[PDB]
Design a protein around this ligand. Structure first.
Ligand SMILES: [Mg+2]
Ligand SMILES: [Mg+2]
Lengths: 363, 4, 364, 4
C-alpha cells in the first residue's frame, strides 16, 4: 500500500497549572518523534500546550492533510472519556474543567476524514475515565465509512493509563512497549496487537492498564508504507550557529539544539579571547517576555540545570514555549571583560527570526 | 505509578 | 493458550412484528453454529426471540460460563448504538422503541466478566445507527480491565450492516466472509483483521459497511484453543407407533436450531387388507402457533426449514416446530390415521396422542 | 441490500 505523504502531530502535556503534573510525556513524545522520522513521517512535536495552542496545532496539521495522506496524532497527557468520546486536557484547563476546555478526538477525526486521508491513526496515551463535571451529551455526525481508521489507546475505557513515579527518563507504560515495535514492517493493527501482548506482561499494570485497539482499516496499511508544506518542514530546522565578534576582539559562539518543535536550547561559549583581555564572560538576556523565561534558570553550566535532559563547556538556556512567540526571537548577548591594567560591559542584539514552530505562523 |  | 471450556450463544432475529423483517439470520446462525461446533464449542442457537426470551437465553448462557471459560456471543438482527452502547432489538420491540425494549451488550459483557471467563468474544451482526427516539442516557459502571475482550462488529458506528435483498440461502455480508476464516488457528484478533480485509474487497458494501474490531485481548487466545448446554439439547428418539388396525407409522425428529425441531412421519407397515392409509400430525400446543396449512408437507423445504431433502429421510411428511422456547407444558400432539379396508366402502379414522416431553431448549 |  502507498501513502501520498505521511504526517504526524505529537503533543505531550505535563506542566498542568491546576492538575497533577506529569513527567514522562517529555521523553515519550521525544522518542516517538524520532521513531516516526525514521519512518519518513513529517513530524511536528509540541510540549505543554494551552487549549488555544492545541487547536492551532491541530489546525496546522489538518492543513497538511490531503487525499491519500497518512495522518497520525499522538497525545500524552491528561484526558477523559464520556460516552465514547475522548477528550484531551490542555495545560491551562481550570479545575474543574469540562468539554469546552478540552479537545474532542472524534471532532479531529471527522475533520481528517474530510481531507480524504488514506490512513487515520490516533495513539492516545491518557486516562479514559468519565469526567463527572461534563454533563453534555453531544451528538456528532456519524462518520463516513472510510475503512481506514485505527486507534491505539494506552488503556481501556473507564481505566487509567500510567507512567512510573521517580523514574528519571523512563517512558510511560504505553511508549515503553510501543517504541520496541513501531519500526516493524507490518500492518499497523498487527503491530499494536503485538504491543498489547507485550504490555500484558507488565506486572506493574496488571488489572489497571491494557492496550485497546479499535480498527476499521480494511487494507494492509503500515507506518512503513512508501510515499509515492515547506513551512511544516522548516518548523524543525534550527537556526545556524553563529560566531559573534565583539569590539574588544572577543568572539563568542552561539549554538542551538532542538528538543521539540517548541523547545530550543541556546548555548554560548568564548571561542577567542585577545591576550589584552585577562578574563571575560558572556551571557544571554532580554528575551521576549512572551517566552516567560526565568533568569535563575538561564545561563547554566549544564543543560540538565535548565531542565533539558536530551541535549548532549558552555552556558545553556532553555527556551520552552516558542509557540507563544508572535514576533522575531530577538535577544541580547552580554559580554563582561577586563584588560590587563584594570570591568567593561558591551552587548550585541541577535535576531534568529521565527525559530522552529514559529515558522508555521500559527498566530 | 502516576495516572494520566 | 488453554480454555476451561468454550461456550457460544447465537441469536438470529427475523420475524419482527413492528419492524422490517430479515431473512439471512436463519442461514447465518445455522452456519456459524456448525463451524463453532467443529471448534468444540457448546453452542445454543436460537431464532426469533422476544425481549423476555433474549434475557432468559443470556441468563442460561451465563450459567455455562465459569473461570477460564471462553464465551462467545453472536447476534444477527436489528440493532442500534447510542452514546457508546450497543443494543440488540428483540422481535417484539414496539415502533418506535427505546433502550428499555432492548438488550445492552455492555451489560452482558459485565456479567460475563463476573464469571471470570478466559475470553469474551462479541460478534455483532447488526446496524449501529443512533436511535433518535431513545432519550435514555444510562451510565453503566466502568468495566474491569480483564484484557480478554474482543468485539467483531459487522459494521462501523453510525453505519448499517447488510444482507442481500432477495437471495435464497445467501449469508449476510459479515458471515459471507467470517465463515471462510473462522476455522483458522490464529489469534481471534488476527482472524477478524483478515475478515476485515476480505470484506474490504466486497464491492457491494464499499462505503457502507466495514468491519470494526475492538480488542483489549493481551494473550494469544484463539477459537481453536484446546479445552483442558446439556439438558438444552435433548431430542426425542425416533419412535414407531402401532395403530389398532395394525398400521405402523414411524415418527422421527431432527434439530434445526435449539428452538426449532422438524417432525416427520412415514408409513412403515400397512396390512394388506388395508388398501390405503395416510398419517399426519395435528393439534399442537397453541403456544407454538403452528398453522396446519404449513404442516404435513411433502418436502422439508415447504415448511420453511434450512434443511433440504438430502438432510432428512425421504418420502415422509414434514412439520416444522419453531418457537419451542414458548412451550409451557409438555409437547403433546396427535398422530392421525385415515384408512380403509379392501372390500369395505367407508374410510376409517383413528388417532393417538404423543407426548415427547419438553424437547431441546424447552427443557429450560 | 437490506440493512439490519
Ligand atoms: Mg474552549
Ligand atoms: Mg512494507
Amino acid at each position: 500500500m502507498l501513502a501520498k505523504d505521511k504526517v504526524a502531530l505529537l503533543i505531550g502535556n505535563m506542566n498542568y497549572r491546576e492538575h497533577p503534573k506529569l513527567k514522562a510525556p517529555l521523553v515519550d513524545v521525544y522518542e516517538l518523534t524520532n521513531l516516526l522520522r525514521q519512518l519518513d513521517f513529517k513530524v511536528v512535536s509540541l510540549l505543554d500546550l494551552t487549549e488555544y495552542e492545541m487547536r492551532n496545532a491541530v489546525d496546522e496539521f489538518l492543513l497538511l492533510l490531503d487525499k491519500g495522506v497518512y495522518g497520525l496524532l499522538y497525545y500524552a497527557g491528561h484526558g477523559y472519556e464520556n460516552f465514547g468520546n475522548s477528550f484531551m486536557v490542555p495545560v491551562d484547563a481550570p479545575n474543574p474543567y469540562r468539554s469546552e476546555n478540552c479537545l474532542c478526538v472524534q471532532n479531529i477525526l471527522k475533520l481528517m476524514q474530510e481531507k480524504e486521508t488514506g490512513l487515520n491513526v490516533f495513539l492516545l496515551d491518557m486516562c479514559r475515565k468519565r469526567n463527572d463535571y461534563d454533563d453534555t451529551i453531544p451528538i456528532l455526525d456519524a462518520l463516513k465509512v472510510t475503512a481506514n481508521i485505527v486507534f491505539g489507546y494506552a488503556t481501556c475505557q473507564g481505566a487509567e493509563a500510567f507512567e512510573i513515579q521517580h523514574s528519571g527518563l523512563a517512558n510511560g507504560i504505553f511508549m515503553k512497549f510501543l517504541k520496541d515495535r513501531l519500526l516493524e514492517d507490518k500492518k499497523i493493527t498487527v503491530l499494536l496487537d503485538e504491543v498489547a501482548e507485550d504490555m500484558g506482561k507488565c506486572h506493574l499494570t496488571k488489572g489497571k492498564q491494557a492496550l485497546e485497539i479499535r480498527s476499521s482499516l480494511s487494507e494492509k496499511r503500515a507506518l512503513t508504507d512508501p510515499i509515492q508544506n515547506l513551512q511544516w518542514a522548516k518548523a524543525h530546522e534550527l537556526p545556524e550557529s553563529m560566531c559573534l565578534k565583539f569590539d574588544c576582539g572577543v568572539q563568542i559562539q552561539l549554538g542551538f539544539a532542538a528538543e521539540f518543535s517548541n523547545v530550543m536550547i541556546i548555548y554560548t561559549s568564548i571561542v577567542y579571547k585577545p591576550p589584552e583581555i585577562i578574563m571575560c564572560d558572556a551571557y544571554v538576556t532580554d528575551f521576549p517576555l512572551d517566552l516567560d523565561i526565568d533568569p535563575k534558570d538561564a545561563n547554566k553550566g549544564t543543560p540538565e540545570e535548565t531542565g533539558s535532559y536530551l541535549v548532549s563547556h558552555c552556558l545553556y538556556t532553555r527556551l520552552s514555549s516558542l509557540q507563544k512567540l508572535k514576533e522575531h526571537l530577538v535577544f541580547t548577548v552580554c559580554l563582561s571583560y577586563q584588560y590587563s591594567g584594570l570591568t567593561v560591559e558591551d552587548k550585541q542584539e541577535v535576531n534568529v527570526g521565527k525559530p522552529l514552530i514559529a515558522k508555521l505562523d500559527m498566530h | 505509578v502516576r495516572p494520566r
